[PDB]
Amino acid sequence: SFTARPSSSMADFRKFFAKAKHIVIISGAGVGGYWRKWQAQDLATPLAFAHNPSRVWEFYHYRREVMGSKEPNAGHRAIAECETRLGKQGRRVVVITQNIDELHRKAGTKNLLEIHGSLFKTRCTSCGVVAENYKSPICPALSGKGAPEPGTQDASIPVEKLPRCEEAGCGGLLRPHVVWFGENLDPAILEEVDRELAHCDLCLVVGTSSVVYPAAMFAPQVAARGVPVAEFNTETTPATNRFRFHFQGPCGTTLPEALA
Amino acid sequence: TARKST
Ligand SMILES: [Zn+2]
Numbered sequence: 001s002f003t004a005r006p007s008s009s010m011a012d013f014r015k016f017f018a019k020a021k022h023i024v025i026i027s028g029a030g031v032g033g034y035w036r037k038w039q040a041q042d043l044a045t046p047l048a049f050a051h052n053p054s055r056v057w058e059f060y061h062y063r064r065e066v067m068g069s070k071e072p073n074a075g076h077r078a079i080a081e082c083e084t085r086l087g088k089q090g091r092r093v094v095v096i097t098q099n100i101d102e103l104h105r106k107a108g109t110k111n112l113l114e115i116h117g118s119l120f121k122t123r124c125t126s127c128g129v130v131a132e133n134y135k136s137p138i139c140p141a142l143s144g145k146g147a148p149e150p151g152t153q154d155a156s157i158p159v160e161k162l163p164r165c166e167e168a169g170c171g172g173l174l175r176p177h178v179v180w181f182g183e184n185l186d187p188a189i190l191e192e193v194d195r196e197l198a199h200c201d202l203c204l205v206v207g208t209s210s211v212v213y214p215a216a217m218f219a220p221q222v223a224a225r226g227v228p229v230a231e232f233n234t235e236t237t238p239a240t241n242r243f244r245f246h247f248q249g250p251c252g253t254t255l256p257e258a259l260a
Numbered sequence: 261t262a263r264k265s266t
Binding site: 041116179180181182183184185187190211212213214 | 261262263264265266
């Protein structure tokens with residue numbers, strides 16, 4: 001149990017990167033946090049939804065509005081373009097994202113695993129159907145709601161006027177198709193994650209990536225197998241010292257360099 | 261283990 005610190009040698013990393021046949025890129029929020037008086041993690045829970053579906057929908061309406069307008073940043077683009085370029089060489093890049101904003105998709109990434117769902121899908125709490133939804137606003141009663149300042153008045157929308165299911169004989173209440181804290185991730189998605197992690201020969205962990213479980217154990221699983229992991233993050237994390245490399249800085253700076 | 265948490 002040597003005091004193992006990660007390398008910051010970019011040239012050594014790029015040596016691995018030139019040879020790698022299957023690169024797994026794990027990403028997080030760099031793309032709690034607070035909306036009004038609440039920690040984001042405390043809205044993103046089925047108990048918040050069961051007990052105040054209006055407050056949760058006002059929050060996800062906000063998130064949909066804010067994120068729906070965002071363009072991909074230099075990190076997303078570099079990751080997308082690295083996938084295309086390596087693709088033409090018979091080399092695999094896959095992104096496993098903890099994010100729900102779809103910005104990897106907007107940047108053109110094709111091999112993408114969204115492990116916590118999407119702002120832009122709903123699921124019906126009655127019949128269970130999942131559907132895409134980019135409609136702004138998602139229902140009329142949320143029009144102009146969702147403002148983030150502490151002190152902003154609650155909408156208090158009656159449940160009947162919240163987003164509703166359009167399937168025949170249904171009209172049930174919709175929720176965001178987002179995996180919430182205390183909910184299980186999709187078992188089929190976790191088995192696919194396992195297969196990518198077991199076969200990759202290089203893993204990057206970006207934006208980080210290391211405080212939401214089980215996703216937080218993904219890169220360390222890869223390193224515990226002896227495969228190199230490079231972490232790109234503005235600060236160090238509880239997992240850093242498990243990895244082969246650590247590149248500090250905003251990843252709109254480092255990632256483009258590392259992936260070039 | 262499959263259960264999302266912080
Ligand atoms: Zn339904």
